[PDB]
Design a protein around this ligand. Structure first.
Ligand SMILES: CCCCCCCCOCCOCCOCCOCCO
Ligand SMILES: CCCCCCCC[S@@](=O)CCO
Ligand SMILES: CCCCCCCCCCCC
Ligand SMILES: CCCCCCCCCCCC
Ligand SMILES: CCCCCCCCCCCC
Ligand SMILES: CCCCCCCCCCCC
Ligand SMILES: CCCCCCCC
Ligand SMILES: CCCCCCCC
Ligand SMILES: CCCCCCCC
Ligand SMILES: CCCCCCCC
Ligand SMILES: CCCCCCC
Ligand SMILES: CCCCCCC
Ligand SMILES: CCCCCC
Ligand SMILES: CCCCCC
Lengths: 343, 343, 343
């Protein structure tokens, strides 16, 4: 909600509380998942063509006891935007790959999980320098593109250390570069994204699968978004980039997500989705295995802009086998039930 | 403070800073206790009869160094309210027992401590589904009641695991059910509450006192709140529910709290209170012991709605003996001195 | 930004996002330093002469992954202010020494580091009771002074325990007292501050250098702040007060900071600074050593009140030798590059 608009600056303080419960035969996925999100979005007019901006968003778990409660920053970035020239921002932000994979990340609770946070340039991550150009310098309506650099986020100790080092190898990265292009016309959308990040020494030298010099991704995507209908599909091919449970990464992974949704005038929005991550030549005697495979059925009822409720049903199609047990991957179904206040 | 009210939604961002110091011969109770509280309370009109709402409240300690600062979510819930029918909300919230025990929880700093947070359905806790009906379907002014279910919050590992598991056994619970009834007329209040929670395996199998299948509470309460006078008393009988320091819980505990307060026109509000928790047949050679016993004398001076100062004097009547030392219970007096800004 | 002003209370919710990157040959100083700051400042009119107030400020790192994100309270205090009589506030706040040392703490990113947080009464710390008088009871325009007491913040365990105890010996303190006087006339400023804190048992008995009964500081300072020119210098002499890396404190330290800045009408503000901390008779075979010594060159460009960008270049003049390696002191240069949105 816009709580300030005055003398060239405006500020939106926004947030939600999601009363959320998971039901599953997998006990680690069963029970209270209530949480809160909170952020600010600030925009200042410097000149008629130049705006300055910043955004910060935080998540705070509401399902924990008071002696041990966890929270985290999702995004935190500052930038400048010049008219018909583009924008630049730096901070914690979304990897440019997400400019396309985001098109299928629209389910009530599940979805968006053929990749992770702090997973190279695929989703949220630290130290993104992002240039964006919208409508191609004002010349081609609907043609957007982005160039992005992500600086090394290394270990907390020793060789490969950065000031913001983290010991979880799955959250590290070397220097990376990526780009995205998207074209939208009359509700139809086509898009493509590529990224290439150097892998750190720790990532290649702690005995995990899916090692090599570089983590790489190539994504194609399509969407239709008009007349109350939302259709979208993304295909992504990754190398040393896609996490395979606790085992490491996939030497090669083939990822696919498709979604269909409809919005009835009275407020109900049914949803049907399919997601799949296919691991190829994984190593360690595993060969080809599904990392992820599920169908998703759900519905959100929107009372108005500030209040909604939903059910999301993940029909988990993975078989319980050696690989999924070793990897620690959930092969059970989950139902999510939520009641959501936002401002 | 209401910082947004527009197009069917309103938002109260509220908070306080309590400059607070404790004085005690017990060194673990002596010194700086400064802290901050912050929250939001949001209400949306869906139709003329249906409102949606959410609330989040957070505490942030202000008495710690910057290298190691602790905070936590007190409440975080979403709900719906239909006129003359009732409300439902789910999240982290107050156990229905507190609908009555809260009547004596009005001291400047102390009080409210014959029970804990994350202590079955007695106070704040995770995963409360709460139905409430006010004025009995609009038929009986002042007659309110509540039915509440609390879902299992189990261990972080192994048998009895939940997705939000916690290893501190004192913060776990099984499935629980409770109810409350309250009648208020012309400043007089009568009320009752019952709860019954299943105990977890961990809680019954780590060698603590006060084990059994279920944690149970029965509470009766009375209050007078008018003509600048506040009188209140609550009696609660608990089984396997009341924490006894580090030792476990009380097989049976008899808890009593009484409070008298007066508000002078010029701003001073003196306070006198008595609290007692009597443990019965505790086990481990202890038999009957006082878990808590103190008299409380204090005064709050209210400069206005946003600024106040207070002294609270806990006259601790527990004797230093084997039980209190073993349990780690404070038997010393504490004086609290506070200066409080709120919005 | 002022987001509430109503019926005698006002509230400023303020904050910034600093997209920040460090470049250094020292890997522990190299990489993403993005962070967010957020606070509130609240003022209530009680009477025409008496205001109540509170302030809370929090920092949240934005350079960390989502599994492990760190934050902390910088200030958190409540107070009262009576006209021509002075103010009193209690909480976590700034030590009165900072009333003068702050005059050189104006660099874009570096500076302000001949002392620390939670470092006796030199900067931010817990449990400050501060009295302040501005314009000497309304009689001498520009004459301000402060008397401050800081209560013991002791260990988490055993002898010397406080309720807010901390095991990091560098963050502990005994009871302390301090004062400050400042005179400002027509852009010229002269000032002095003294503090004296008792040292804790832990601080004197864990085998560190720079032990003794008391940590003491004496500070003199000068500034010129007009006609777009900012000049400032502070000299501080400390005993058992100034931290020497991991080794302990300096038996005596001589600290000096000087700063020159200019603000061009079009927005650029160049900055040149010099900082030095000279350790005397340190013990452990070290004798006299520089604890800190660097020249600082930088520039901030202010797009407007809400948006700015800067480069800060710390030319580190310390030599890599036995002392700096043993102490763990950075002897390398750092360049900081920042883009800053604030409200
Ligand atoms: C192997 C081909 C290399 C391609 C050249 C590009 C270099 C790779 O990306 C560098 C990542 O580091 C960028 C760090 O960002 C610092 C920006 O700070 C912005 C603050 O406003
Ligand atoms: C705020 C104006 C300065 C930033 C513009 C830089 C990016 C524009 S364009 O080059 C995007 C493609 O890289
Ligand atoms: C309905 C009557 C209100 C309850 C009466 C008890 C008041 C407490 C007095 C004891 C003071 C410590
Ligand atoms: C509410 C008016 C005074 C009530 C005092 C009753 C005695 C309570 C103690 C019994 C616990 C076993
Ligand atoms: C050790 C003796 C202390 C006094 C006993 C407590 C009585 C307090 C009464 C409250 C007035
Ligand atoms: C000798 C100095 C010790 C300081 C004691 C601090 C007490 C201040 C408490 C006031 C709280 C509002
Ligand atoms: C050095 C900053 C400009 C980099 C060019 C952006 C397009 C790749
Ligand atoms: C926008 C530039 C990205 C380059 C990707 C490199 C593929 C090996
Ligand atoms: C040692 C005496 C405590 C200080 C009281 C402060 C209240 C103004
Ligand atoms: C190796 C750090 C030196 C960079 C200084 C650049 C000055 C703008
Ligand atoms: C045990 C299942 C309870 C579900 C109630 C709300 C769906
Ligand atoms: C910009 C001034 C540099 C002084 C360097 C001293 C070695
Ligand atoms: C519960 C009765 C306690 C008495 C001990 C002296
Ligand atoms: C400025 C020096 C003070 C003297 C006390 C040791």
């Amino acid at each position: 909600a816009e709580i300030y608009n005055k003398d060239g600056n405006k500020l939106d303080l926004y947030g939600k509380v999601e009363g959320l419960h998971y039901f599953s035969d997998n006990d680690s996925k069963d029970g209270d998942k209530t949480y809160m999100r909170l952020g600010f979005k600030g925009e200042t007019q410097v000149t008629d063509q130049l705006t300055g901006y910043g955004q910060w968003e935080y998540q705070i778990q509401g399902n924990e006891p008071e002696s041990d409660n966890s929270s985290w920053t999702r995004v935190a970035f500052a930038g400048l935007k010049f008219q018909d020239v583009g924008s630049f921002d730096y901070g914690r932000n979304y990897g440019v790959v997400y400019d396309v994979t985001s098109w299928t990340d629209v389910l009530p609770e599940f979805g968006g999980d053929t990749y992770d946070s702090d997973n190279f340039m695929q989703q949220r991550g630290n130290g993104f320098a992002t240039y964006r150009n919208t409508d191609f310098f004002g010349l081609v309506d609907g043609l957007d593109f982005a160039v992005q650099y992500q600086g090394k986020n290394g270990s907390a100790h020793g060789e490969g250390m950065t000031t913001n080092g983290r010991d979880d190898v799955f959250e590290q990265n070397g220097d990376g570069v990526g780009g995205s292009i998207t074209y939208n016309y009359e509700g139809f959308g086509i898009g493509a994204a590529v990224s290439s990040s150097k892998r750190t020494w720790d990532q290649n030298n702690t005995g995990l699968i899916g090692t090599g010099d570089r983590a790489e991704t190539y994504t194609g995507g399509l969407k239709y978004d008009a007349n109350n209908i939302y259709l979208a599909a993304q295909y992504t091919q990754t190398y040393n980039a896609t996490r395979v449970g606790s085992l490491g990464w996939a030497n090669k992974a083939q990822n696919f997500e498709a979604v269909a949704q409809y919005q009835f005038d009275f407020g109900l929005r049914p949803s049907l989705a399919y997601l799949q991550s296919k691991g190829k030549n994984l190593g360690r005697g595993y060969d080809d295995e599904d990392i992820l495979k599920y169908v998703d059925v759900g519905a959100t009822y929107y009372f108005n802009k500030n209040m909604s409720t939903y059910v999301d049903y993940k029909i988990n199609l993975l078989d319980d086998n050696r690989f999924t047990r070793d990897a620690g991957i959930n092969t059970d179904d989950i139902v999510a039930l939520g009641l959501v206040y936002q401002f």
